[PDB]
């Protein structure tokens, strides 16, 4: 199965995990199954336990101005692996490593933001830290610990959604509609610009842009918008006419490197990723539960010489087949 291990800088206290990816369903989150390994010596005088911090940095340079660390822990759970059920993966680890293998399991609650970062670090990142300490609250050195970083992501559901539509009229009965609600990363987006002009005023050009909403909430709700793409056309309509045409747009990162505040998927290391996937929240129960919320909405604007509409859609990865490597496959 080729499980993942990360040995500490110290010559012991290694951590075994089956996979470095935990999906977040609309109902429950997969348990963080794993086994922490340690030699019989050096443990009898202390107690071993594994932490799980849902860190959230919202600053730069880790400035400490006026005692403001710029960080935030959203979910901290500690389980004592020291002896006082197990899954198939957990029991297989026990029979292989030996008797001195201590399972540890967490339970991530729902309504938690996924691991999403921002292009410059700021963003939501998780971490699994394992260290041994009898006091369970004393300071632990960096070398006697494992900085094993994990990420939690959401995937597109099997059931699709209805086609978005908007009918914002102004005195120009614009009627836009997307091809489908579910869109995968790197796939083209087709929007209809079927309009109906009746006033004497004449439109100059049609501007179509796709903007990413990074609904970051720490103290007050924020509505950062990044035009990840732009399809400024030159079409126009006279009174009593129309310009029904299927314009095609495709968001990507090749032309969005210079943009600041862009939201991307969680990065284990400095290796680069794609745009941040849309985050799904429970219907009705969704509220200000901190973290970062990513949503996508296209915009069709008419420049008369304005009428604007918003059509939300979901941009998410499909279900992986075997496992996501979470790194540049053709690296270096």
């Amino acid at each position, epitope marked *: 199965t*080729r499980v993942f291990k990360k040995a500490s800088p110290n010559g012991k206290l290694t951590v075994y995990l089956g996979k470095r990816d935990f999906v977040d369903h609309i109902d429950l989150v997969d348990p963080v199954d794993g086994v922490v390994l340690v030699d019989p010596e050096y443990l009898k005088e202390r107690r071993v336990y594994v932490t799980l911090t849902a860190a959230f940095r919202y600053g730069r340079e880790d400035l400490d101005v006026l005692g403001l660390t710029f960080r935030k822990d959203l979910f901290v759970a500690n389980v004592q692996s020291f002896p006082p059920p197990l899954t198939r993966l957990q029991e297989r680890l026990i029979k292989k490593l030996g008797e001195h293998a201590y399972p540890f399991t967490f339970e991530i609650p729902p309504n938690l933001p996924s691991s999403v970062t921002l292009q410059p670090a700021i963003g939501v990142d998780y971490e699994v830290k394992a260290f041994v300490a009898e006091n369970l609250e004393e300071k632990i050195h960096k070398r006697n610990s494992v900085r094993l970083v994990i990420e939690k992501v959401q995937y597109a559901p099997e059931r699709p959604g209805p086609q978005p539509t908007a009918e914002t009229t102004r005195q120009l009965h614009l009627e836009a509609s997307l091809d489908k609600e579910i869109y*995968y*990363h*790197g*796939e*083209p987006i087709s929007v209809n610009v079927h309009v109906t002009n009746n006033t004497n005023k004449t439109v100059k050009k049609i501007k179509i842009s796709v903007r990413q909403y990074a609904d970051i909430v720490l103290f007050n709700t924020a509505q950062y918008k990044v035009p990840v793409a732009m399809e400024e056309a030159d079409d126009t309509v006279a009174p009593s006419s129309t310009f029904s045409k299927v314009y095609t747009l*495709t968001p*990507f*990162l*090749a*032309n969005n*490197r210079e943009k600041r505040g862009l939201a991307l998927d969680g990065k284990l290391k400095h290796e*680069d990723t*794609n745009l941040a996937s849309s985050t799904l929240l429970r219907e009705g129960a969704n509220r200000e539960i901190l973290g970062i919320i990513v949503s996508y909405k296209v915009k069709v604007k008419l420049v008369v010489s304005d009428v604007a509409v918003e059509l939300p859609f979901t941009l998410m*990865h499909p279900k*992986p*087949k*075997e496992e*996501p*490597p979470h790194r540049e*496959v*053709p*690296e*270096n």
Partner: single-chain antibody
Amino acid sequence: DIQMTQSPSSLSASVGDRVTITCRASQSVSSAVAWYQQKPGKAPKLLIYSASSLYSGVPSRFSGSRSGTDFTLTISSLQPEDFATYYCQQYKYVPVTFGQGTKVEVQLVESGGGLVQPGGSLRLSCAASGFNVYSSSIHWVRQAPGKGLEWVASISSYYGYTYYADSVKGRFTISADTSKNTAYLQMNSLRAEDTAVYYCARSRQFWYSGLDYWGQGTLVTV
């Protein structure tokens, strides 16, 4: 770099046998190993894209396993439509290298190619249909007559990254037109050792899983 070697250079068997092909990697690569089957005169076909995961379409008889660096492919029964050349590729690093080949005994079309004097220029048009350039990765692989496959260059339009082989750096350039959904390869200062059949292969841009679809062949002789 990393060199990929296959233990059996020529395998002879009969119908209804269990054969084993051993391919050992020079370095300690991950499970990112792909196996291909190239019929004589036909483009290679992917069989296993993770050294353990079966592809969609290939019969379930083919299977793979790994131990340290001992990637191997096993065939339960050799039907008459099985005798071909098998290549093992590692795709953990940019200089992807194919195996030496074991002898057993969405459409992509390319244009161009012809007799060109040394030092000349030539362009290959990889007409691509059925997929998006942003959602896929385009790779160019050549094959000398009767020899193994060799990687040339690749382009990733989503991240705007271009990679070239050490033997074709600078002299070769790669470009793709998003509007026409085509891949173009331009050659400069064609040397005498570049006589090979050029393949325009496609791989998934997101979570690379081997070259799913290949080309047809536009062999260029200088």
